[PDB]
Amino acid sequence: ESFAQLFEESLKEIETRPGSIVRGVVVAIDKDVVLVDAGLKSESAIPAEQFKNAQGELEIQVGDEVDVALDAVEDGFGETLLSREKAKRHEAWITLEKAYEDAETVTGVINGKVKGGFTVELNGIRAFLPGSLVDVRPVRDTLHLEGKELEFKVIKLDQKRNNVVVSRRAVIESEDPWVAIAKRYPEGTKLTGRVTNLTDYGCFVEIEEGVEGLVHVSEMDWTNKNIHPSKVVNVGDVVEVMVLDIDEERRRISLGLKQ
Amino acid sequence: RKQVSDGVAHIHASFNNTIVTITDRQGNALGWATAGGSGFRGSRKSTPFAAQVAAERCADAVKEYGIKNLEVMVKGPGPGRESTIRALNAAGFRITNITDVTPIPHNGCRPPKKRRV
Amino acid sequence: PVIKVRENEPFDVALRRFKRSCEKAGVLAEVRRREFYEKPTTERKRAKASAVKRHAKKLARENARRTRLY
Amino acid sequence: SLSTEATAKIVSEFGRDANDTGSTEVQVALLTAQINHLQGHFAEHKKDHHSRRGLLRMVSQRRKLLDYLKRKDVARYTQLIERLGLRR
Amino acid sequence: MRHYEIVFMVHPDQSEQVPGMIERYTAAITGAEGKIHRLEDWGRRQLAYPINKLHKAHYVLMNVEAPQEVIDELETTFRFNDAVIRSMVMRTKHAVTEASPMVK
Amino acid sequence: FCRFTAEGVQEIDYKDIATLKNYITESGKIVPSRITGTRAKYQRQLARAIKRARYLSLLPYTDRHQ
RNA sequence: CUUGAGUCUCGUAGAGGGGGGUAGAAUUCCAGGUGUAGCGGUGAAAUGCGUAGAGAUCUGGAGGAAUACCGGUGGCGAAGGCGGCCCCCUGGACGAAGACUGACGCUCAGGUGCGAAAGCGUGGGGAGCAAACAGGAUUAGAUACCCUGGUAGUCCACGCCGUAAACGAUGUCGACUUGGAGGUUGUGCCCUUGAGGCGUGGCUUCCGGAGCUAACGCGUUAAGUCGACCGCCUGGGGAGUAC
């Protein structure tokens, strides 16, 4: 009756758009496709690679619940964007938690700087930070035992584009993209960027707060022309890339991957 | 002749023939060479190789001036564009600036009519 | 496309950079375009035709894609 | 176009209520004034054809209005044409 | 009457004469009960390209609510005056009293 | 992803040279609305501003000219 | 009487029109410097320009014409058409609310006006381009295509001409009939918590349903379902010609 109308606004009230409410129960597993049902119009074709943790093998059997993401509806048939990004929000929440007590503590282990800041990895994910953040002083973890255990003390974060440089060792110590496009500029600043869509000439890795990068086909590997970028890297994956070129005018930052 | 350390190389690259002219920084031409002059005619002189050899010839010609530094100004569309500069480099000048100086009007004069072939 | 060779920069690299700059400018293309007079009508026609082609590529092909080849 | 103040003045004079504005007579007056204004312009600028089209249209409209007035109420029309000095 | 925005560029050798010129311009505006809402000597400035062979010039911004006759007169003065290289009287909707982004 | 919609500007200013400089080429040319992602309404205004600047020698018409 | 039609208020976007200024690039020519044998052109050549110093290159000057980028199945205009920037004069469109007028409307034979390009007249101008013309090729020939030159003309003023595949090959005005993806330009609300969310108007591009259609296709911008008025067709040629 209005039973159904009320039930509709009820079901509106008991779901939200992003990957927030851990609701999809894994109702069929087959390599290489997981699939859930979070109270959406259809079931997700999940990769297996959004769900294996830190050494390669699966972690969740039938009935298990992770939220995914949304705001994109129907490409022909199907429903979602991946739950792994979901996870990013959780990471953001832990990073935010720092603010409360002015100190987020986990483990951060940063061996080296792709682009001037040691890389820190938290749980499954690994992030890149600006060069200062790795060390509190001028200590430098190059003399430290390789891939050492500390935590991360945050030095610097870019707040829009996601780059976070964190503080290893020293426990005792405690319009918008395009005007100032000189931060990752200078010749070869390495970046960690998720690829988006590979347009048979390109790969379109673009992460640093509303920009566009290409890594088109010529570098990508150490073979030139026979490569076909879909075979050689991925879809949706955070990779090794650096700038090689910026035009701040005809917004074409032309990144590379042969480095 | 007065020796000069730094100068310009003007590379007039047409569809039919490349012309390389080495000059001082002020404008006064020191030497020049062409693909047509280098012993290439018609099909041959409208090629990168021809351009390169013209460039080489030009370089040879301005040996007595003792030119070390060189800025390149590349004009027009042609094969003799990249090749010529490479040749120049080989000949052994420190290439300082590489400028493009193609005359692009901002819609000015009417071009000649389109060929019917 | 004005360029200056950086200190301890290779020649080849510089050349490549220059080429890239030129490409960006679209100087050669521009030159090609202005070689001969294009009647206004012709210009119009090309533009519209090109647009049409683009549209065809975008939508019809997308529709095709939905169905598998084998 | 006709300046706001001028328009207001025109309305006040011819319009009975002064808030009315849409009275036939008032409208006619407005048209007439505009036409008068544009005469000066068109003396200067004889090749301004596009602009003249608008003027022509306005004139036509005025004529129509006059015609309408005539059938409805003759005396009023007569008065109007005395005021404005319209030959017909 | 009509809110104009004027920017004129003086020859850099006549930079010491500029204030007087400005004053004169103001005076004329005042004469016809014209207001002058902002006035900004930008000073000596490097030109993006060398107009009339010279590389720097002295820019003056000036916003004015004046009748058009006076504007015309001003324009005429500018054209004949050899100190002022370029001018650009340019209409505006409102008074725009707040300062320019290059002054700030 | 237009800047002027977000800022919410009433009119683009030719005097605001820095802003303009983001939308102009290394070669001096005005950058397309595809690349910048500027809104159409604003784009025209921006172009106009640039043109004005060029007239006032605030921006250059081109890189080569002198 | 107020639903059609119009008037008033405030805004909005616009290559809409007319007039007058100005800017920068590029071509051409002139004067001069540097410099030395080629340049130019084509499928390949030659005519042509060059040692009387060309081409290249730099400096200065003259003058005309057009406005790169922006720029878009974008915008404006009744159509023709309209594109750097600035000012002056000026026409239309749309939206927001109200207020007013009170059928004042629609269509239109004759009539009147506007009407690309070429063309004509008189007077200016003349850089580039280029009918005609000349030479060089090509060819069996080449009164063409290609090359080197090149005059009317293109440009401005004021007149005339009154036609174009002046095309959406689709008269104008009004009403009604499933949808989707855009673009552009308003405007109301909403925590603009952000580039957004939900509407509501105008103009516009593409796809497609019913229906229609000889089919192709059209499809809320109809070529569907209807009404009002006008224009026009009646086998091909002869002929849009003769008188």
Swiss-Prot record, chain B:
Give the record's GO biological process terms.
translation
InterPro entries, from UniProt? Ribosomal_uS11, Ribosomal_uS11_bac-type, Ribosomal_uS11_CS, Ribosomal_uS11_sf
Q: Which UniProt keywords apply?
A: Ribonucleoprotein, Ribosomal protein, RNA-binding, rRNA-binding
Q: What NCBIfam families does the record point to?
A: PRK05309.1 (NF003698), uS11_bact (TIGR03632)
Q: What does this protein do, in the record's words?
A: Located on the platform of the 30S subunit, it bridges several disparate RNA helices of the 16S rRNA. Forms part of the Shine-Dalgarno cleft in the 70S ribosome.
Q: Which family does it belong to?
A: Belongs to the universal ribosomal protein uS11 family.
Q: What is this protein called?
A: Small ribosomal subunit protein uS11
Lineage of this protein's species? Bacteria, Pseudomonadati, Pseudomonadota, Gammaproteobacteria, Enterobacterales
Query: Encoded by which gene?
Result: rpsK
Curated annotation (Swiss-Prot), chain E:
Picking any one GO biological process from the record gives: cytoplasmic translation
Q: Does the keyword Manganese apply?
A: no
N6-acetyllysine occurs at 93
| GO cellular component terms, A-Z | cytoplasm; cytosol; cytosolic small ribosomal subunit
GO molecular function annotations of the record: mRNA 5'-UTR binding; small ribosomal subunit rRNA binding; structural constituent of ribosome
The record describes its post-translational modification as: 5 different forms of the protein, varying only in the number of C-terminal glutamate residues, were isolated. The sequence shown is form bS6-6, which is the longest. The first two Glu are encoded by the rpsF gene, the other Glu are added post-translationally by the RimK enzyme.
Q: What are the UniProt keywords, alphabetically? A: Acetylation, Ribonucleoprotein, Ribosomal protein, RNA-binding, rRNA-binding
Question: What is the similarity comment for this entry?
Answer: Belongs to the bacterial ribosomal protein bS6 family.
Subunit structure as annotated in this protein's UniProt entry:
Part of the 30S ribosomal subunit. Interacts weakly with uL2 in one of the 3.5 A resolved structures.
User: What is the role of this chain?
Assistant: Binds together with bS18 to 16S ribosomal RNA.
For this entry, the protein name equals Small ribosomal subunit protein bS6
Source organism per UniProt: Escherichia coli (strain K12)
Q: Which residues of the full protein are shown?
A: 1 to 104 of 135
